[PDB]
Amino acid sequence: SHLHNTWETYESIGQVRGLKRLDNYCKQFIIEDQQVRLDPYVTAEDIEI
DNA sequence: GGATGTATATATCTGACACGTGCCTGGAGACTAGGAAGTAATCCCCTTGGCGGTTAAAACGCGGGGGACAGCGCGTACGTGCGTTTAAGCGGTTGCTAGAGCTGTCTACGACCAATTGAGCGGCCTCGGCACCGGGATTCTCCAGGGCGGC
Numbered sequence: 001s002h003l004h005n006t007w008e009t010y011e012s013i014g015q016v017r018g019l020k021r022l023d024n025y026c027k028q029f030i031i032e033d034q035q036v037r038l039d040p041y042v043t044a045e046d047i048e049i
Numbered sequence: 050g051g052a053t054g055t056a057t058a059t060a061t062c063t064g065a066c067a068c069g070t071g072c073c074t075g076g077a078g079a080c081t082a083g084g085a086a087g088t089a090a091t092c093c094c095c096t097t098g099g100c101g102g103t104t105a106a107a108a109c110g111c112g113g114g115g116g117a118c119a120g121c122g123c124g125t126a127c128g129t130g131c132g133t134t135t136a137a138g139c140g141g142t143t144g145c146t147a148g149a150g151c152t153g154t155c156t157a158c159g160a161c162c163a164a165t166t167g168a169g170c171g172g173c174c175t176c177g178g179c180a181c182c183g184g185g186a187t188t189c190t191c192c193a194g195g196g197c198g199g200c
Binding site: 018020021024 | 131132133
């Protein structure tokens with residue numbers, strides 16, 4: 001019901017359904033997050049949008 | 050004592066039957082010409098059952114090795130499942146144009162018919178080339194004379 005959302009960890013989950021949803025989330029969100037944070041070719045407009 | 054399950058009755062929806070109308074296409078009746086059925090003659094091909102001789106193909110047997118098939122391992126590539134994206138499917142706008150259908154007019158083009166004649170089919174004579182026969186030129190095998198040796 002979107003109210004029992006819990007702050008979990010990889011070792012706190014074990015093996016449940018939809019683990020690869022979290023894998024895609026963590027993986028590619030952290031890849032472009034660290035990519036745009038470590039790129040020197042980043043303008044102010046892109047980071048603010 | 051209250052509400053629920055179930056039966057019969059009434060209004061509405063929907064496919065099907067019959068009525069109506071046009072129209073145009075099929076049917077009835079009559080006439081005519083020619084397509085095809087029938088006839089006779091001639092000639093060549095096919096049928097059935099044989100014979101004779103050649104000969105190359107078919108059949109049979111046998112050895113052997115090449116290839117088909119089975120089994121096993123392996124690794125890769127395709128199936129399967131899930132999450133995400135994306136584009137198909139539907140409904141919609143807005144004008145213009147292509148095309149089917151219908152009507153109308155007309156003109157060039159093709160059917161049709163008669164006379165003609167020239168291109169297609171058959172045979173005949175001739176030439177180009179290949180082949181058969183007679184005559185001249187060139188080269189190969191052979192018989193005889195001269196010289197030498199032996200008793």
